[PDB]
Amino acid sequence: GSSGSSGVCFVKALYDYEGQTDDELSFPEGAIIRILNKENQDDDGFWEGEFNGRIGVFPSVLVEELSSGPSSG
């Protein structure tokens, strides 16, 4: 069981991020990431996602949400 949120999420790195340490995630300008955990309240505000076979953490600020709909404009 342990069912809660059933709906993966993705995000594109608007600006290339250079992870300080391994724990962090390093992706080029415009890289897609697979959100794994979005539980951040006390901590600074970094999420966890896997990329190119690498699991790290990002400030969730250098990325943009990917919706399944065209932007009105």
Torsion of CA 58, 64, 68, 73, to 10 degrees: 170
Which DSSP helix (H) or strand (E) runs through 1? Answer: none
Would you call 73 helix, strand, or coil by DSSP?
coil
**Topology at the third CATH level for domain 1-73:** SH3 type barrels. (2.30.30)
The strand order across the sheet containing 54-58 reads 54-58, 47-51, 32-37, 9-13, 63-65
Its sign, for the CA torsion 37, 39, 42, 28, is positive
One-letter amino acid for residue 66 of the chain: L
Structure determined via = NMR
Domain boundaries, the chain: 1-73
Q: Which two tokens stand for residue 13?
A: 């790195």
Which residues, 6 or more positions from 11, have their beta carbon under 8 angstroms from its beta carbon?
Answer: 32, 33, 35, 49, 60, 63, 64, 65, 66
3-state helix, strand, coil in the chain (%, to 5): 0, 35, 65
CA distance 71 to 69: 7
